[PDB]
Design a protein around this ligand. Structure first.
Ligand SMILES: NC(=O)c1ccc[n+]([C@@H]2O[C@H](COP(=O)([O-])OP(=O)(O)OC[C@H]3O[C@@H](n4cnc5c(N)ncnc54)[C@H](OP(=O)(O)O)[C@@H]3O)[C@@H](O)[C@H]2O)c1
Ligand SMILES: NC(=O)c1ccc[n+]([C@@H]2O[C@H](COP(=O)([O-])OP(=O)(O)OC[C@H]3O[C@@H](n4cnc5c(N)ncnc54)[C@H](OP(=O)(O)O)[C@@H]3O)[C@@H](O)[C@H]2O)c1
Lengths: 343, 338
């Protein structure tokens, strides 16, 4: 009865994540802990960044990557009141989620709803927490606002478009490759823009010359400034990624140095004479703020049960094909969440 | 039968604002304009900064200062449908409000509700609009949050404390002189702090070690950084003044400008916001929705402007002293009077 795991031994291309096996030791959870078997795991942009050595919250090598999964608790430690063996939970953690068996703090798990599948549960947490906190806690989304959702056909992107639809009369500018544009219109993008073939600043200002109310900035680098200058009065640009660093399977020092030189900085007089806000969000730095993230997860489960959000699964891959899964995200082929299953 | 006005002749001390009179010509407002007679006018910190030559939005000298008033519409220009002669209105403008008769775009006026006096009306707009848009539009105040309200005994300060009370279970840290501390607690301040005699960062972090959720920064300069480092995760510091430039010794920290990078904000899970109401002219729909929400809160009895003192034009100097020498608690008002 062997257990399967993916391990990142070194930094580089796809081949640096390797499949391994381990003897199924008896489950022994500590105090306030849960050991559970994973049915599905999320592939995140942060996992690609960590594989290239550009995610600083990654523990030392070698390590099993992955920050979210969904499965069934097989053993419960002491002090855990709400969990019993056999409960289905989605887990958010710093690393170690690309493996069949994992042990995590009970307070970092969340009860999966009834009709929610393992795939949907594994797709919910990272993307929808990030989108909810970018648009509402920082963005303060309101009826009548305009939102620029970059990478709108991605995980965070599709989640943010759905959450925008939960707010009355919200105009959504979404950027993604032209092929995905049709999918974008199905998900709620009001104005699809292919930023690979056009200048999205110009397209937006041709539609809305005064700009937009919220700009979601996963691109980072120079793009941050573009977002800042697309803001209407009282607007907010929420920066939460550096996706311009990812160009290929291996880290490339040219994009690293270009973002290192073109960092966005703002001064108090700059913000004051404008009527704009700059916000930063990092879910990795929210661990230990379990009350906050838990309230967000409760809002998200409420929205799911009411049928206002439903994670879109692009593709599911076994561990043996983890490389291809990563390609699906790095070659910009995915529309929605990419998932891994333990073969 | 002449009409009175105050004029700013030069930049400097209190004596640089002089009283003048002019014959009362018949009101002739242009298209989309209103000419109205003012019963009360607001004294704002911006007026002091403009008198000292520190307000960038001030028209060239000489000019009548003042940015808010309340009065009676005496003549209506062409194209104005919602305003009629005799209407009681609050007016917001960039300058020219320290005078008996003034002409302004009709879209910069707001019908005063009854049971609101003219003095409360003249105290409402600048302070409560600024406080509302700092706490809600940028700050996104929610139940359970903690707010640091600097200058909590001033106009914006008291307005912001009242608006904080309109949200359930909001911890308010307020900074003002120790005397006004009692007034602070009467207005809704949970933890009065005298930043003249203690370090408000230390006091806050002794009460709440993780900091606060929203920091209202009228101080500017080095204090902005302090505010930024007082923020809990998802916190917001909304800077909306440079009150440290109106020092009136001088420390080495006084020269510290605030600057922040995208990765710093990202790593700290924080937000820095700037608000300047003067740069919102021409955004009448936004400010008008803010005024409507404020009038709603007033009708429900959740906000009531606190008037510190009312002064005639001839005593304008004393009025400015009341604010510049840190004596005021609430709004300072000017009336034409005798
Ligand atoms: N701060 C946080 O807490 C947090 C949390 C979650 C995610 N994030 C960030 O949110 C962004 C998206 O995350 P995600 O997980 O949902 O993945 P994702 O959106 O699916 O990213 C893949 C898609 O982004 C687009 N893309 C843009 N630039 C790309 C690049 N250099 N390489 C590959 N694809 C690129 C591609 O689609 P198109 O070309 O068609 O547009 C691609 O299909 C990422 O920057 C992530 O780092 C941050
Ligand atoms: N950006 C915008 O659109 C906008 C709009 C309105 C106001 N503002 C800004 O909000 C700030 C407060 O405006 P305000 O009209 O309500 O004035 P205020 O609050 O009445 O300020 C006076 C009070 O501030 C305190 N204070 C702090 N530093 C001071 C100093 N260096 N000199 C004198 N007094 C000082 C004094 O009381 P204590 O010492 O007891 O505290 C004094 O009682 C101002 O900086 C204003 O520029 C901005």
């Amino acid at each position: 009865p062997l257990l399967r795991c993916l391990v990142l031994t070194g930094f580089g291309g796809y081949d640096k994540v390797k499949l391994q096996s381990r003897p199924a030791a008896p489950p022994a959870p500590g105090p306030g802990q849960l050991t559970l078997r994973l049915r599905a795991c999320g592939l995140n942009f942060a996992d690609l960044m960590a594989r290239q050595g550009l995610y600083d919250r990654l523990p030392p090598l070698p390590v099993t990557p992955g920050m979210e999964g969904a499965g069934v608790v097989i053993a419960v430690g002491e002090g855990v009141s709400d969990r019993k063996a056999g409960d289905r939970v989605m887990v958010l953690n710093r690393s170690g989620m690309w493996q069949e068996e994992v042990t995590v703090p009970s307070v970092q798990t969340f009860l999966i709803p009834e009709a929610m599948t393992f795939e949907e549960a594994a797709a919910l947490l990272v993307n929808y927490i990030t989108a909810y906190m970018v648009l509402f806690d920082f963005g303060n989304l309101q009826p009548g606002h305009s939102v620029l959702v970059h990478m709108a056909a991605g995980g965070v992107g599709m989640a943010a478009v759905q959450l925008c639809r939960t707010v009355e009369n919200v105009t959504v500018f979404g950027t993604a490759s032209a092929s995905k544009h049709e999918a974008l219109k199905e998900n709620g993008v009001t104005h699809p823009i292919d930023y690979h073939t056009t200048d999205y600043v110009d397209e937006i200002k041709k539609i809305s010359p005064k700009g937009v109310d919220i700009v979601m900035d996963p691109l980072g680098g120079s793009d941050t400034a573009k977002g800042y200058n697309l803001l209407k009065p009282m607007g907010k640009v929420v920066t939460y990624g550096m996706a311009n660093l990812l160009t290929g399977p291996k880290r490339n020092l040219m994009a690293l140095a270009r973002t290192w030189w073109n960092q966005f900085s703002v001064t108090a007089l700059q913000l004051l004479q404008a009527n704009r806000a700059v916000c930063g969000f990092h879910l990795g730095y929210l661990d230990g703020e379990v009350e906050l993230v838990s309230g967000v997860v409760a809002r998200l489960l409420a929205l799911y049960n009411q049928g206002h959000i439903k994670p879109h699964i692009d593709s599911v891959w076994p561990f043996e094909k983890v490389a291809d899964a990563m390609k699906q995200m790095q070659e910009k082929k995915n529309v929605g969440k990419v998932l891994l299953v333990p073969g």
